[PDB]
Amino acid sequence: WXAXCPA
Amino acid sequence: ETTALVCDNGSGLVKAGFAGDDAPRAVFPSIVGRPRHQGVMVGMGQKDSYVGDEAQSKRGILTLKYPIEHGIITNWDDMEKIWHHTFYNELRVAPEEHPTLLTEAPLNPKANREKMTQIMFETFNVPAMYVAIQAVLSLYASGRTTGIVLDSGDGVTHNVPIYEGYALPHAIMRLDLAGRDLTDYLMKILTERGYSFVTTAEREIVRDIKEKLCYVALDFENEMATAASSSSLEKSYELPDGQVITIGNERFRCPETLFQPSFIGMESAGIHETTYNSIMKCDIDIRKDLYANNVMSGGTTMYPGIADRMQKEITALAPSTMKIKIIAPPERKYSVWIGGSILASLSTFQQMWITKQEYDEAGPSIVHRKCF
Amino acid sequence: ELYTKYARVWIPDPEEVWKSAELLKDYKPKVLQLRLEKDLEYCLDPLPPLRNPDILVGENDLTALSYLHEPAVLHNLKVRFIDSKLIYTYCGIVLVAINPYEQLPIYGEDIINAYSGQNMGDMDPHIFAVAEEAYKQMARDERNQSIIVSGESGAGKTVSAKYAMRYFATVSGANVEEKVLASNPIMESIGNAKTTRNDNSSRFGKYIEIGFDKRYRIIGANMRTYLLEKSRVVFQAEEERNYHIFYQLCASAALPEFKTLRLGNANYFHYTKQGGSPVIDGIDDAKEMVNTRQACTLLGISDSYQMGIFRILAGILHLGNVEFASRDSDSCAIPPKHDPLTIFCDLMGVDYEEMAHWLCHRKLATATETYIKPISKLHAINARDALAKHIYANLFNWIVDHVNKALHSTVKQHSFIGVLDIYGFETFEINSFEQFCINYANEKLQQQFNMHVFKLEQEEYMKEQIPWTLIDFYDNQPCINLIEAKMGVLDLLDEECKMPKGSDDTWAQKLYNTHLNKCALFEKPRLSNKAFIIKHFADKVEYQCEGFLEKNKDTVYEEQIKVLKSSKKFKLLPELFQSKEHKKTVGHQFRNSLHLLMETLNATTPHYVRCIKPNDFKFPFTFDEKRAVQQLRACGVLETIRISAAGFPSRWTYQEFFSRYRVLMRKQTCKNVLEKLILDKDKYQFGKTKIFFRAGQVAYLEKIRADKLRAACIRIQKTIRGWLMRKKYMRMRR
Amino acid sequence: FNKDQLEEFKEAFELFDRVGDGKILYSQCGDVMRALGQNPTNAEVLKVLGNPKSDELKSRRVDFETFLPMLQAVAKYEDYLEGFRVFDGNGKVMGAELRHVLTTLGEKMTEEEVETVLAGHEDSNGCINYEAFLKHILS
Ligand SMILES: Nc1ncnc2c1ncn2[C@@H]1O[C@H](COP(=O)(O)OP(=O)(O)NP(=O)(O)O)[C@@H](O)[C@H]1O
Ligand SMILES: Nc1ncnc2c1ncn2[C@@H]1O[C@H](COP(=O)(O)OP(=O)(O)O)[C@@H](O)[C@H]1O
Ligand SMILES: [Mg+2]
Ligand SMILES: [Mg+2]
Ligand SMILES: [Mg+2]
């Protein structure tokens, strides 16, 4: 994604 | 005349076809493989990289990777490759000839819709296009105007409630658990039984086990006590080379994690609870009709028994006096495409396509106001 | 004014749509003293039609009358039909015929002699007078000619076409006409229905292409059919029958051959029963079957195929009795040992257990993978009825094609003249998908007529070197765009068949949102939210939304046809069938068949007939304004009349004008002496051989005629009376 | 009219007295008016007569003195030509047509009157020189 999750 | 292209990017399978027919006429994984070894033989037709069913077949020598992870697109060059392969090789139809309809999961970064439009207009010159929520199309596919949808592919799981064709934004729940990241768990529990699958090719081999042999236990605790006591649940499967592997409680134990995401160390409760806690955010006048229709969609809902586990525990959570009905046709793996195929063939929908005139006027910002 | 002591007018009355009125003394620039046919005072509303000068009335062609309006036309048709006993009449190119219900001398060989060679100027109208123009145009050019026939049913479209071609047979000399007239019993039986206002209504367009060889002797014929009304097979409104063949067959059922079929009585079967009315008045179904078979034999379908045909129709009926019990809302099954399905699967030589499977289930194939899945009891009943409609339409196309094989003939066909029977514009209290489609097809033919008549006027004007611009085009493209353009009524109906939980309530609401004020031609009936109104060329017609989603749904699940095709018991069934098309709705199939009809006719320069049926209890040679005003509107003649009163209706060859008018009073001098007499100037025009007038100038010209001739007579008589009395004086001097 | 005119006209009037009372009938009034050069219509004659009823027209008798004001009041070619030219452009008129119009239009006359006045004025084709017939009847 951009913050929390890896993508 | 001209007929819309209808495409669902998913993760794993891409499935595409012309609107107004019964089922997609291209399905292939959304996978791109690049070769990693030194090629020795000369004059071989060796190639930059492979897409889809090619990379599945050659996968022994490839690094497979997926350009879509939890419904976000993470690579753009590989995604362009996959769409390019879809339109030219799989459908053998130019984009210029046809408006395109594209599918997406809700609650995910707006940059994704911006980029996906910018590509479809600029590189393909698709004459018009639209971007649509998966859950919405599952109701078109199942013949209903009211219901709560549970849709899970690889990556994203989400619930959308819909009541007489109004959406209910505040009640939308989204969950990253489903489908890909069951398999990463299943690899670990198989490691407990002394098999080790490391590379991405071995990941595809695990995924084929998961599709073949997992099922959901009506009561998890009785079935663990049973398989602990007995071999009767135990089935054996033949790896591609001709070894044979035997798997026990691991087969039901893997899809249990959809009901207890603590198994992988996520915080949130399973699909039964987010489905219920979605219904709880709707106004009391409609809950009877949401409880009366639940539509399950996408491949992760295929496991034998998942509907009947779901009905049992929602019936435990829900107040006692009502029908809980779970509606899960055998076709459900394609329902998002089938519903897109209905939707793009309507006449009313012909006024809703974003057209190149407007994109050229407005830039890619337009997608947010015109589309959902 | 044009109103004077002497003028005459028409005023309305309930018993007969118009009555004549003399005018007691003039309207002055109110309310009118009138006297009738013996007292009236008649309200003007803040003026009545001026009757034409009676020197014109009574004649071949209506367009000539100086004042063109509905009571004058209906007057001519009354006088010449009842008193003169002439049926045929002309309105521009349109021929007009009143059905007499009575035989006449006019069709005889001596009349064939009389017309053959003549042109349209030469004679009084008769159907042969059109047939000989068609033949003259076909001689002038390779170009084919068409003859187009319209009316309500029982207006005699068939008898008119019959004589129309008998004229060809007698001029050219091919034992086609015997065969064509022997084809009719079966195409009545398969093609016609009882309807609320008629028996033996024809529900389809039938085109007989009469083909000629270079010598214009007749080769043969080819037959086509369009616009067959499929939905009637499975559904009737109250007081309608299903297509006659079903009832002829059911009445026969006691007979030896048909014993095999286990046919019930006429109200045993779900498809026959719904309409309510098994017995047509005064007709032997049991005999009419026999005349059907006899004519089928005369066109040389073997007695094997006739028993095939009746097997298939018994199949369609026994199929109709299949009944589904729901085991979920989502799913249903046929309760086992179901006698309707048992007999159906025996009759059509298939496995009971496969029709049992495929009626209840539908199958979907992905490119690698395929699923059986069940369907709801509603979808089951829809799919069964759609299968009956599919079988029936394919059987009709097959008897069409066999009749073709026996008509159609060995010598190849140089060129042809074509004869089209098609139903007219139609209204009842209750108007429903069938009437909607019929009225749409009639709107589309009326376009062609309007455009062709416009163009053949315009070219006459160019032949006179008259300035074009005075001609005006009456356009009805805005209504067709309402019915058939995208986001049109047929379009949102084909949409609502897709939409989940589609209903006639939501369909109506879509209509209103789309059109209700965005267009002038669509209107909502004041008191109802279930109906809508279209402004057609003739009429405003109110349609009920109740029917359309029942009738418009056609889909056939291919697995059902691939069951039937397997059947080995008799050849005919797999002979009938011959995948995109299976998804089309009835409305869209009709919209396509109509385009083939248009592409057939637009190729070809038409001549028209209109038939009208002057009374409803069918008494001989008797006439009612009630009935005829309606039918003359339905046939569109009353629009034609008005569109021709707009423009320049009246036209005059110079010397014959001057031949009388000097009696009041060459081309330039007479033009000038007119122009000094009268300011007609804008309302008259000049060309190579004629002056044209607008309406009502010819009357004014006779009014000035009477003014002069009366004044002259007063002077002439007083002058000669001067000697008359001086004569009695000279007598007295003696 | 002066005394000389009145004397000649009165003598003519008295010639019409068929009863000896020095009077004529109303119906002879027209003969005297027309014989003296007037060409009044039957309407004009009835107006100066007072729109008489059948009975007084047929039996009431008037002397010259009462007739005279009516004759005076009544007394006080191109139109004649155009009137004949109505039925013509070579200057002729069918004898059948003139006979028909005189016996069928306007104040219709008898066939015998028309035969007497028309005798000798139509030629072999059955055409009437209307200028000559008009001059004849105006003389
Ligand atoms: N010119 C005519 N001469 C004699 N009978 C006629 C004539 N025109 C119509 N008819 C009558 O029309 C009736 C029905 O004729 P038919 O040949 O069956 O065709 P039709 O029923 O009029 N076709 P349709 O208009 O669809 O009902 C018969 O009773 C005929 O007597
Ligand atoms: N028959 C099956 N049983 C269990 N899991 C399946 C089955 N078929 C596919 N899956 C899994 O579901 C995922 C594919 O779901 P899908 O709906 O195709 O995803 P998407 O919606 O992204 O296309 C993959 O992880 C696949 O392994
Ligand atoms: Mg998906
Ligand atoms: Mg008929
Ligand atoms: Mg008939």
PDB file of C-alpha atoms in Angstrom, chain C residues 92-199:
ATOM      1  CA  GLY C  92     -53.667  10.590 -55.311  1.00  0.00           C
ATOM      2  CA  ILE C  93     -51.944   7.348 -56.237  1.00  0.00           C
ATOM      3  CA  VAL C  94     -53.896   5.489 -53.548  1.00  0.00           C
ATOM      4  CA  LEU C  95     -56.611   3.230 -54.808  1.00  0.00           C
ATOM      5  CA  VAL C  96     -59.545   2.907 -52.415  1.00  0.00           C
ATOM      6  CA  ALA C  97     -61.983   0.019 -52.255  1.00  0.00           C
ATOM      7  CA  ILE C  98     -65.063  -0.469 -50.104  1.00  0.00           C
ATOM      8  CA  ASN C  99     -65.837  -4.104 -49.444  1.00  0.00           C
ATOM      9  CA  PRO C 100     -69.404  -4.646 -50.688  1.00  0.00           C
ATOM     10  CA  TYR C 101     -69.902  -8.114 -49.177  1.00  0.00           C
ATOM     11  CA  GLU C 102     -71.550  -8.669 -52.542  1.00  0.00           C
ATOM     12  CA  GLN C 103     -70.526  -9.866 -55.968  1.00  0.00           C
ATOM     13  CA  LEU C 104     -70.224  -7.501 -58.902  1.00  0.00           C
ATOM     14  CA  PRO C 105     -69.668  -7.636 -62.674  1.00  0.00           C
ATOM     15  CA  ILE C 106     -66.523  -5.505 -62.471  1.00  0.00           C
ATOM     16  CA  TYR C 107     -63.947  -8.312 -62.323  1.00  0.00           C
ATOM     17  CA  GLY C 108     -64.849  -9.991 -65.629  1.00  0.00           C
ATOM     18  CA  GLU C 109     -62.736 -10.699 -68.694  1.00  0.00           C
ATOM     19  CA  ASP C 110     -64.556  -8.002 -70.668  1.00  0.00           C
ATOM     20  CA  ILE C 111     -63.385  -5.508 -68.055  1.00  0.00           C
ATOM     21  CA  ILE C 112     -59.884  -6.974 -68.363  1.00  0.00           C
ATOM     22  CA  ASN C 113     -60.121  -6.113 -72.058  1.00  0.00           C
ATOM     23  CA  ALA C 114     -61.559  -2.691 -71.196  1.00  0.00           C
ATOM     24  CA  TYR C 115     -58.664  -1.646 -68.953  1.00  0.00           C
ATOM     25  CA  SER C 116     -55.766  -3.333 -70.754  1.00  0.00           C
ATOM     26  CA  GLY C 117     -53.973  -0.643 -72.739  1.00  0.00           C
ATOM     27  CA  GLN C 118     -55.483   2.257 -70.781  1.00  0.00           C
ATOM     28  CA  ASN C 119     -53.545   4.758 -68.651  1.00  0.00           C
ATOM     29  CA  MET C 120     -54.649   6.304 -65.347  1.00  0.00           C
ATOM     30  CA  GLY C 121     -56.265   9.249 -67.128  1.00  0.00           C
ATOM     31  CA  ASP C 122     -58.208   7.031 -69.496  1.00  0.00           C
ATOM     32  CA  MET C 123     -60.717   5.384 -67.185  1.00  0.00           C
ATOM     33  CA  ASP C 124     -62.605   5.180 -63.957  1.00  0.00           C
ATOM     34  CA  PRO C 125     -60.603   3.449 -61.220  1.00  0.00           C
ATOM     35  CA  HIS C 126     -60.622  -0.289 -60.780  1.00  0.00           C
ATOM     36  CA  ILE C 127     -58.044  -2.652 -59.295  1.00  0.00           C
ATOM     37  CA  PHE C 128     -57.071  -3.583 -62.828  1.00  0.00           C
ATOM     38  CA  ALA C 129     -56.325   0.102 -63.452  1.00  0.00           C
ATOM     39  CA  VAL C 130     -53.508  -0.130 -60.897  1.00  0.00           C
ATOM     40  CA  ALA C 131     -52.404  -3.557 -62.104  1.00  0.00           C
ATOM     41  CA  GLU C 132     -51.988  -2.096 -65.591  1.00  0.00           C
ATOM     42  CA  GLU C 133     -49.830   0.754 -64.300  1.00  0.00           C
ATOM     43  CA  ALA C 134     -47.637  -1.772 -62.540  1.00  0.00           C
ATOM     44  CA  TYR C 135     -47.398  -3.624 -65.855  1.00  0.00           C
ATOM     45  CA  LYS C 136     -46.662  -0.401 -67.776  1.00  0.00           C
ATOM     46  CA  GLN C 137     -43.879   0.647 -65.388  1.00  0.00           C
ATOM     47  CA  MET C 138     -42.394  -2.842 -65.591  1.00  0.00           C
ATOM     48  CA  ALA C 139     -42.434  -2.489 -69.372  1.00  0.00           C
ATOM     49  CA  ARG C 140     -40.839   0.973 -69.215  1.00  0.00           C
ATOM     50  CA  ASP C 141     -37.988  -0.135 -66.943  1.00  0.00           C
ATOM     51  CA  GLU C 142     -36.380  -3.303 -65.714  1.00  0.00           C
ATOM     52  CA  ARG C 143     -37.442  -1.901 -62.348  1.00  0.00           C
ATOM     53  CA  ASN C 144     -39.792  -4.118 -60.363  1.00  0.00           C
ATOM     54  CA  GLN C 145     -43.161  -2.866 -59.169  1.00  0.00           C
ATOM     55  CA  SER C 146     -44.997  -3.654 -55.951  1.00  0.00           C
ATOM     56  CA  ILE C 147     -48.632  -3.579 -54.920  1.00  0.00           C
ATOM     57  CA  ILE C 148     -49.407  -3.050 -51.256  1.00  0.00           C
ATOM     58  CA  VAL C 149     -52.709  -3.831 -49.607  1.00  0.00           C
ATOM     59  CA  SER C 150     -54.004  -2.704 -46.236  1.00  0.00           C
ATOM     60  CA  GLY C 151     -57.084  -2.630 -44.061  1.00  0.00           C
ATOM     61  CA  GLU C 152     -58.725  -4.103 -41.079  1.00  0.00           C
ATOM     62  CA  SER C 153     -59.386  -7.801 -41.414  1.00  0.00           C
ATOM     63  CA  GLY C 154     -62.450  -8.602 -43.493  1.00  0.00           C
ATOM     64  CA  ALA C 155     -61.738  -5.611 -45.731  1.00  0.00           C
ATOM     65  CA  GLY C 156     -60.958  -8.075 -48.504  1.00  0.00           C
ATOM     66  CA  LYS C 157     -57.197  -7.640 -48.856  1.00  0.00           C
ATOM     67  CA  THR C 158     -57.037 -11.209 -50.123  1.00  0.00           C
ATOM     68  CA  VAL C 159     -59.788 -10.939 -52.729  1.00  0.00           C
ATOM     69  CA  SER C 160     -58.278  -7.675 -53.948  1.00  0.00           C
ATOM     70  CA  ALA C 161     -54.848  -9.271 -54.407  1.00  0.00           C
ATOM     71  CA  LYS C 162     -56.512 -12.342 -55.958  1.00  0.00           C
ATOM     72  CA  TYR C 163     -58.128 -10.343 -58.725  1.00  0.00           C
ATOM     73  CA  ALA C 164     -55.039  -8.151 -58.975  1.00  0.00           C
ATOM     74  CA  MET C 165     -52.994 -11.139 -60.105  1.00  0.00           C
ATOM     75  CA  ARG C 166     -55.843 -12.681 -62.136  1.00  0.00           C
ATOM     76  CA  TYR C 167     -55.429  -9.596 -64.308  1.00  0.00           C
ATOM     77  CA  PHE C 168     -51.799 -10.596 -64.889  1.00  0.00           C
ATOM     78  CA  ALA C 169     -52.768 -14.172 -65.646  1.00  0.00           C
ATOM     79  CA  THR C 170     -55.319 -13.057 -68.249  1.00  0.00           C
ATOM     80  CA  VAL C 171     -53.077 -10.461 -69.909  1.00  0.00           C
ATOM     81  CA  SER C 172     -49.918 -12.565 -70.021  1.00  0.00           C
ATOM     82  CA  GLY C 173     -51.279 -16.112 -69.980  1.00  0.00           C
ATOM     83  CA  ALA C 174     -49.181 -19.905 -65.732  1.00  0.00           C
ATOM     84  CA  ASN C 175     -51.403 -22.155 -63.695  1.00  0.00           C
ATOM     85  CA  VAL C 176     -49.785 -20.157 -60.952  1.00  0.00           C
ATOM     86  CA  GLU C 177     -53.081 -18.561 -60.038  1.00  0.00           C
ATOM     87  CA  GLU C 178     -54.743 -21.912 -59.392  1.00  0.00           C
ATOM     88  CA  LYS C 179     -51.841 -22.912 -57.144  1.00  0.00           C
ATOM     89  CA  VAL C 180     -51.704 -19.582 -55.325  1.00  0.00           C
ATOM     90  CA  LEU C 181     -55.445 -19.734 -54.697  1.00  0.00           C
ATOM     91  CA  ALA C 182     -55.039 -23.333 -53.512  1.00  0.00           C
ATOM     92  CA  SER C 183     -52.340 -22.297 -51.013  1.00  0.00           C
ATOM     93  CA  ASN C 184     -54.689 -20.153 -48.964  1.00  0.00           C
ATOM     94  CA  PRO C 185     -56.473 -22.755 -46.754  1.00  0.00           C
ATOM     95  CA  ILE C 186     -53.268 -23.842 -45.019  1.00  0.00           C
ATOM     96  CA  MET C 187     -51.831 -20.362 -44.562  1.00  0.00           C
ATOM     97  CA  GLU C 188     -55.143 -19.318 -43.086  1.00  0.00           C
ATOM     98  CA  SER C 189     -54.966 -22.301 -40.751  1.00  0.00           C
ATOM     99  CA  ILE C 190     -51.374 -21.770 -39.549  1.00  0.00           C
ATOM    100  CA  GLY C 191     -51.394 -18.001 -39.920  1.00  0.00           C
ATOM    101  CA  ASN C 192     -54.721 -16.554 -38.783  1.00  0.00           C
ATOM    102  CA  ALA C 193     -56.408 -16.164 -35.416  1.00  0.00           C
ATOM    103  CA  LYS C 194     -59.670 -15.148 -33.854  1.00  0.00           C
ATOM    104  CA  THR C 195     -59.405 -11.715 -32.263  1.00  0.00           C
ATOM    105  CA  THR C 196     -61.764  -9.624 -30.143  1.00  0.00           C
ATOM    106  CA  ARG C 197     -63.010  -7.647 -33.156  1.00  0.00           C
ATOM    107  CA  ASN C 198     -62.687 -10.348 -35.830  1.00  0.00           C
ATOM    108  CA  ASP C 199     -62.568 -13.960 -36.860  1.00  0.00           C
TER     109      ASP C 199
END
